[PDB]
C-alpha cells in the first residue's frame, strides 16, 4: 500500500499517468487564432501578379478544398480521421473567440456591436473559403452515422453560424438548392432518429453499478465504468438542434420553408415534423422519469443531474422549434398546428404541474426548480 | 404502428398481459374456440 514498496517501473507508470492527467491536460494553450491567421495570409502571390485574377487559393482555402474533396468522394461510409477532426476543432475555436468574449454587468452598445463585428470577421475568414459548403458536404457524407466526424462537423457549423449571420445562411441555402441533393436532409433525419432520450433502465443499472463500489485492477474506485449511460450524446443532440436553429436564425424565411418542404428535390423530408416527433419522445421519457420519482420523497443527486440533462436538451429543442416559426412563416405555423405538437405540450404541462409542487416541498432542490421553470418559460 | 402512437377505431393490436406477461390467444385446438393467456400471439380488434 505504501508507494515505496511498489516496483520502480510501475511507480514511474503511475507518475506518468497522473502527471499527464494533472499538468499537461490542464496546461491550456491558444494557437488556433494564430495558425488560422497564418494560413489565411496569402503571401507574396498578389505581389508577383497583381493583374492576374482568379489567383491561387490561400493555404487555408486549399486546406478546406482538400476536406471538401474527401467529403465529395464516393464511399460507403466516412472513415474517421484525426486530421480533419483536429482541423475542424481548430477552425471552430478560431471563431469561438468572440463567442465567449476572449456578474454580467451592462455592456456599451459600441462594445457589443464591435464584438459582433469581430465575430463576423472571424466567420468570414472561413466562409469565404468554402467552409460553409464543406460542413454541408460532410454532414451529407456521414449518412446519419453518429460519430466524432459528424460531431466535429456540427460544432464547426455552429461556430460559423453563431449569431445567425446571413451570409453563411445564404451560401448554405444556395449550395443545397443548386446541388439538389437529398443526402444532407436524409442524414439529418437519421441523426435525429438516433438521438437518445431518458432511458430509466440504464438509470437503474448505473445506480446499482455506482452503489456496487468494488476494487478492480484500476484501484478502489472503478474508473472504467461507463460514465453516462442514461443520457449519452446529450452534447451531440444539443449541437444538432443548435445547428438546425442557427440555420433559421434571424428569421430567414427561405431556409424555414426549405426545412419544411424542399421543392426541387425528388424527396422531401419535413424536418419540422421530425423535430416535433423527437420532442414527443423526450416528453414521454421525462414523464416516465417523473413517475419513477413520484413515490420518492426527495430526488437524489443522480436524479437531479439526469433531470438537468433532459431539461436542458428539451430547452434546446424548444428554442429550435420556436426559431422555426418566430418569423411569421404561415407554412410552418400550419404544419406545427396540424402536427403532434399539442400532445407533447399537454404532456409537458402535466409534468410541470406535478414537478413544481414536488420540488417546492423541499429546499435542497431549488436549483432544479429554477431550471424547470426556465424550461416552462421556453 | 410504433409504440407511443395513438390507436384509431378498427385497429388490430396485440394485448399482452401485465399479470402473466402472456398474449391473449385464441385456442381452437380443442374445437370449442376458447380464449387463454398463452404465448401464441393473437391479433385483436377493438371496435367501439
Amino acid at each position: 500500500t505504501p508507494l515505496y514498496n511498489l516496483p520502480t517501473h510501475r511507480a514511474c507508470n503511475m507518475f506518468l499517468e497522473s502527471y499527464k492527467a494533472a499538468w499537461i491536460l490542464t496546461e491550456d494553450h491558444s494557437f488556433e487564432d494564430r495558425m488560422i491567421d497564418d494560413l489565411s495570409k496569402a503571401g507574396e502571390q498578389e505581389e508577383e501578379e497583381e493583374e492576374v485574377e482568379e489567383k491561387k487559393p490561400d493555404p487555408l482555402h486549399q486546406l478546406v478544398l482538400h476536406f471538401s474533396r474527401t467529403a465529395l468522394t464516393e464511399k460507403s461510409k466516412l472513415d474517421e480521421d484525426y486530421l480533419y477532426m483536429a482541423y475542424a476543432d481548430i477552425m471552430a475555436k478560431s471563431c469561438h473567440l468572440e463567442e465567449g468574449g476572449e456578474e454580467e454587468v451592462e455592456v456599451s452598445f459600441e462594445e457589443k456591436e464591435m464584438e459582433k463585428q469581430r465575430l463576423l470577421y472571424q466567420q468570414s475568414r472561413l466562409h469565404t473559403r468554402g467552409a460553409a459548403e464543406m460542413v454541408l458536404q460532410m454532414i451529407s457524407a456521414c449518412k446519419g452515422e453518429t460519430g466524432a466526424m459528424v460531431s466535429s462537423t456540427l460544432k464547426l457549423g455552429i461556430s460559423i453560424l453563431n449569431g445567425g449571420n446571413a451570409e453563411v445562411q445564404q451560401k448554405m441555402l444556395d449550395y443545397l438548392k443548386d446541388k439538389k441533393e437529398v443526402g444532407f436532409f436524409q442524414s439529418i433525419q437519421a441523426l435525429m432518429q438516433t438521438c437518445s432520450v431518458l432511458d430509466l433502465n440504464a438509470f437503474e443499472r448505473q445506480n446499482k453499478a455506482e452503489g456496487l463500489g468494488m476494487v478492480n485492477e484500476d484501484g478502489t474506485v472503478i474508473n472504467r465504468q461507463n460514465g453516462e449511460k442514461v443520457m449519452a450524446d446529450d452534447e451531440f443532440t444539443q449541437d444538432l438542434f443548435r445547428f438546425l436553429q442557427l440555420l433559421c436564425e434571424g428569421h430567414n424565411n427561405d431556409f424555414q420553408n426549405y426545412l419544411r418542404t424542399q421543392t426541387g428535390n425528388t424527396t422531401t423530408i419535413n424536418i419540422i415534423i421530425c423535430t416535433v416527433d423527437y420532442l414527443l419522445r423526450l416528453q414521454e421519457s421525462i414523464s416516465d422519469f417523473y413517475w419513477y420519482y413520484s413515490g420518492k420523497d426527495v430526488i437524489e443527486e443522480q436524479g437531479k443531474r439526469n433531470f438537468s440533462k433532459a431539461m436542458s436538451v428539451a430547452k434546446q429543442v424548444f428554442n429550435s422549434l420556436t426559431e422555426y416559426i418566430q418569423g411569421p412563416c404561415t407554412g410552418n405555423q400550419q404544419s406545427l398546428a396540424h402536427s403532434r405538437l399539442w400532445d407533447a405540450v399537454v404532456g409537458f404541462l402535466h409534468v410541470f404541474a406535478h414537478m413544481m409542487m414536488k420540488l417546492a416541498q423541499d429546499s435542497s432542490q431549488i436549483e432544479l426548480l429554477k431550471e424547470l421553470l426556465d424550461l416552462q418559460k421556453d | 404502428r410504433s409504440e407511443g402512437e395513438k390507436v384509431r377505431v378498427g385497429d388490430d393490436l396485440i394485448l399482452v398481459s401485465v399479470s402473466s406477461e402472456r398474449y391473449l390467444h385464441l385456442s381452437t385446438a380443442s374445437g370449442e374456440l376458447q380464449v387463454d393467456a398463452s404465448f401464441m400471439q393473437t391479433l385483436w380488434n377493438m371496435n367501439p
Binding site: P2, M14, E17, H66, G219, Q225 | -
Partner: protein, 610 residues
C-alpha cells in the same frame, strides 16, 4: 521522421525525469512515514496521514501528492520545496521544448514557415502531398497535444525483463506482419507458433497495462475479422486460447474485450469454433465474474443470443446430420452452449443480477420455441417426458449413434442447462420477502413454466452405478453418453432457488425419492475400488455441491421428526460414511461434516442411538 524523433526524445526525457522523481518522492514518503510512526498521538494529523500516505491505492496517493501545480493546491501539500521546484522547472522546460513560450531557428519554426511557403507558392494538386504538409503543420503547431496523444502508448519496464519483452515485440512483429497477408497453411502455422510463444512470455502476465498499450488484442481481433469473414478451424481454435486468457489476466483487459462484445455475438455460431475454443467462449469470458460488465451488458446482445437459441431449437444441428446422426429436429449442443453464455451473463458471484435476469426471462419466454419439444403446449410434453425419451435415446445405440457425440446425453445436458439458467434467474430470497413486484412475477413465471412434479421425478431416476463385471476389473458406465449427477445438481438448483423447501412433509418426500438412493450409491461406491471411478467422482462433487448444502439450510425443518425416523437414521448413517474421508477433497469433506453437525443439532438424541 525528424519530427517523430523529436517527439520520441521528449517522451524518453519524460520517462527519465519520472525515474529521477520517483526516488525523491519515495524518500520524502519514507521521512513522513517515519515521523508518523514516531508520533501519532495527534488524532487529526494521524488520520490525515492514514488517508493520504496510508490506506489508499498508490495511484490515489501519487495523485494527491502530485496535485500541487496550482498555487492554492501547493499551499498545503506533503512535498518539500526542493522537490516542488524541481518539478516546476521540468514543466517549464517541457513547455520550452514544445515551443509554448525572418530567420528560422528551430525545427518547429522551420517546418511551419516551410509548409506555409509551399502552400503560398502555388496551388498544390497532389492530395497526398496536401495532407502531408498539413499533417506536419498541425504537429509542429500543436506540440503538447502530440505528447498527450503519445503518452498512452508510453510504458516503462524494469531492465531485468528487457530480453523477455524483446521476444514479446518480435512475436507481435510477425503477428502484424502476416496481418496484411492473406491466410495460408504455413502462415497459419507461423502465427500459431507466435501465439504459443506469446503464451510462454512471462511479461504477458506480469505486465497487462503494456499489453493494452501495445494493443495486440486489437491486432488478433482483426485477424479474427479475416478468418471469420468457415475456414482455418485451427485459427478459430487459437482465438480464445489467447483472447480469453487475456481476459483472465486482469479486470481492465476484460473491460477492453467487453467493448467488442457486439461483434463476437454478431458472428456467434456453433459452426464457428466447433471444437474447443469459440467466439462464444470469448464472449462469455468477457462477462465472467464482473458485476459492472454484467450490468453494462445491453439488452440487444441478449436479443441476439435468444434468437440464436431459438434457431437451435427450430432445427437439428447441420453438423450432426452431416455426421449422420438421426434427425432430431432441434439442436441440443448449440442450445447448451448458448445457455452457458446466458448463465454467465445472468449469474455472478453467487448472486442473480435482477435486470439481466428480467430481460433474459422475458426474451426466452417471448420465444416459446427456445425451450424445445418439452415445456411447450404444441409439443404436449414436459420435462419428465423429455428425460424419459432422452434416457431411451442413450439406451439404444441405434439412435444414440450415427462417435464421441451422444444424442441422449446432449439432449438432457441441454435441458439441464435450461433448468440451471432458470434457477440462476430466480429472484433473491430477500427480494421476494420485501415484495418486489417484478421479482414476484418472475418467480411466478418460473413456477408456471417448470412444474414441481417433473423435478422430483427427474431426481427420482437414479444413476447407473459402475459394476465389477469380470473379476479383477472395474467396468464403468459412459458418463459422456448417459445421465450424470451434474444434471441432478442443475435440476435441484431449481428446487433450492425457485420453489424452496418450507414443508417438512415435502422435505422428507424429496429425500425419500431420489436423494437417499444417491447417498446409498455414495456409500456403496465408498470402497477404494470405486473411489477413483469417474462416475463416483461426479456423484461425489454432486453431493458436496448441491445435496448437503441444501440439507444444512433445511436442518431446522428436521426438528420434531418422529415419523419415518429410521429413514433419517439411514440418512445420517450415510452422512457419517462420507464423513469418513475416502478419496475426498478437504473442502468437500468439510462440507459433509458441517452438514452432519447441522443435522445433529436438530435431530432428537432419542433418535440418534444408532
Amino acid at each position: 521522421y525528424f519530427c517523430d524523433q523529436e517527439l520520441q526524445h521528449r517522451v524518453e526525457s519524460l520517462a527519465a525525469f519520472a525515474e529521477r522523481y520517483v526516488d525523491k518522492l519515495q524518500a520524502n514518503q519514507r521521512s513522513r512515514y517515519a515521523l508518523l510512526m514516531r508520533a501519532f498521538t495527534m488524532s487529526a494529523a494521524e488520520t490525515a496521514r492514514r488517508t493520504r500516505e496510508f490506506r489508499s491505492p498508490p495511484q490515489e496517493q501519487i495523485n494527491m501528492l502530485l496535485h500541487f501545480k496550482d498555487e492554492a493546491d501547493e499551499e498545503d501539500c506533503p512535498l518539500p520545496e526542493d522537490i516542488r521546484q524541481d518539478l516546476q522547472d521540468f514543466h517549464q522546460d517541457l513547455l520550452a521544448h514544445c515551443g509554448i513560450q525572418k530567420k528560422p531557428q528551430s525545427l518547429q519554426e522551420l517546418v511551419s514557415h516551410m509548409v506555409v511557403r509551399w502552400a503560398q507558392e502555388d496551388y498544390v494538386q497532389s492530395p497526398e502531398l496536401v495532407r502531408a504538409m498539413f499533417s506536419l503543420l498541425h504537429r509542429q503547431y500543436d506540440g503538447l497535444g502530440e505528447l498527450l496523444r503519445a503518452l498512452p502508448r508510453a510504458y516503462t519496464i524494469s531492465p531485468s525483463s528487457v530480453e523477455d519483452t524483446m521476444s514479446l515485440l518480435e512475436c507481435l512483429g510477425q503477428i502484424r506482419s502476416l496481418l496484411i497477408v492473406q491466410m495460408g497453411p504455413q502462415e497459419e502455422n507461423l502465427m500459431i507458433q507466435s501465439i504459443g510463444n506469446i503464451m510462454n512470455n512471462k511479461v504477458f502476465y506480469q505486465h497487462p497495462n503494456l499489453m493494452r498499450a501495445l494493443g495486440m488484442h486489437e491486432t488478433v481481433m482483426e485477424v479474427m475479422v479475416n478468418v471469420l469473414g468457415i475456414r482455418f478451424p485451427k485459427m478459430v481454435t487459437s482465438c480464445c486460447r489467447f483472447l480469453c486468457y487475456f481476459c483472465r489476466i486482469s479486470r481492465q483487459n476484460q473491460r477492453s474485450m467487453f467493448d467488442h462484445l457486439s461483434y463476437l455475438l454478431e458472428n456467434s455460431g456453433i459452426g464457428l469454433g466447433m471444437q474447443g475454443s469459440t467466439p462464444l467462449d470469448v464472449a462469455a469470458a468477457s462477462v465472467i465474474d464482473n458485476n459492472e460488465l454484467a450490468l453494462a451488458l445491453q439488452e440487444q446482445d441478449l436479443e441476439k443470443v435468444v434468437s440464436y437459441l431459438a434457431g437451435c431449437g427450430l432445427q437439428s444441428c447441420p453438423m450432426l446430420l452431416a455426421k449422420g446422426y438421426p434427425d432430431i429436429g432441434w439442436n441440443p449442443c448449440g442450445g447448451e452452449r448458448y445457455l452457458d453464455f446466458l448463465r454467465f451473463a445472468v449469474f455472478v458471484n453467487g448472486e442473480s443480477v435482477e435486470e439481466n435476469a428480467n430481460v433474459v426471462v422475458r426474451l426466452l419466454i417471448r420465444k416459446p420455441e427456445c425451450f424445445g419439444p418439452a415445456l411447450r403446449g404444441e409439443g404436449g410434453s414436459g420435462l419428465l417426458a423429455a428425460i424419459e425419451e432422452a434416457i431411451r435415446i442413450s439406451e439404444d445405440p441405434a439412435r444414440d449413434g450415427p462417435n464421441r457425440v451422444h444424442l441422449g446425453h446432449a439432449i438432457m445436458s441441454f435441458y439441464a442447462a435450461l433448468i440451471d439458467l432458470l434457477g440462476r434467474c430466480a429472484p433473491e430470497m430477500h427480494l421476494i420477502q420485501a415484495g418486489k413486484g417484478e421479482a414476484l412475477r418472475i418467480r411466478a413465471i418460473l413456477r408456471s413454466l417448470v412444474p414441481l412434479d417433473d423435478l422430483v421425478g427427474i431426481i427420482s431416476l437414479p444413476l447407473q452405478i459402475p459394476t465389477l463385471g469380470k473379476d479383477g476389473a472395474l467396468v464403468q458406465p459412459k458418463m459422456s453418453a448417459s445421465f450424470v449427477p451434474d444434471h441432478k445438481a442443475s435440476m435441484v438448483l431449481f428446487l433450492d432457488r425457485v420453489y424452496g423447501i418450507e414443508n417438512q412433509d415435502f422435505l422428507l418426500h424429496v429425500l425419500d425419492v431420489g436423494f437417499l438412493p444417491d447417498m446409498r450409491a455414495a456409500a456403496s461406491l465408498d470402497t477404494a475400488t470405486f473411489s477413483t471411478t469417474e462416475m463416483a467422482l461426479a456423484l461425489n462433487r454432486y453431493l458436496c455441491l448441491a445435496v448437503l448444502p441444501l440439507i444444512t439450510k433445511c436442518a431446522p425443518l428436521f426438528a420434531g421428526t418422529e415419523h419415518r425416523a429410521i429413514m433419517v437414521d439411514s440418512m445420517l448413517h450415510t452422512v457419517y460414511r462420507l464423513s469418513r474421508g475416502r478419496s475426498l477433497t478437504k473442502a468437500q469433506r468439510d462440507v459433509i461434516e458441517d452438514c452432519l453437525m447441522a443435522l445433529c443439532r436438530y435431530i432428537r438424541p432419542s433418535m440418534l442411538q444408532h
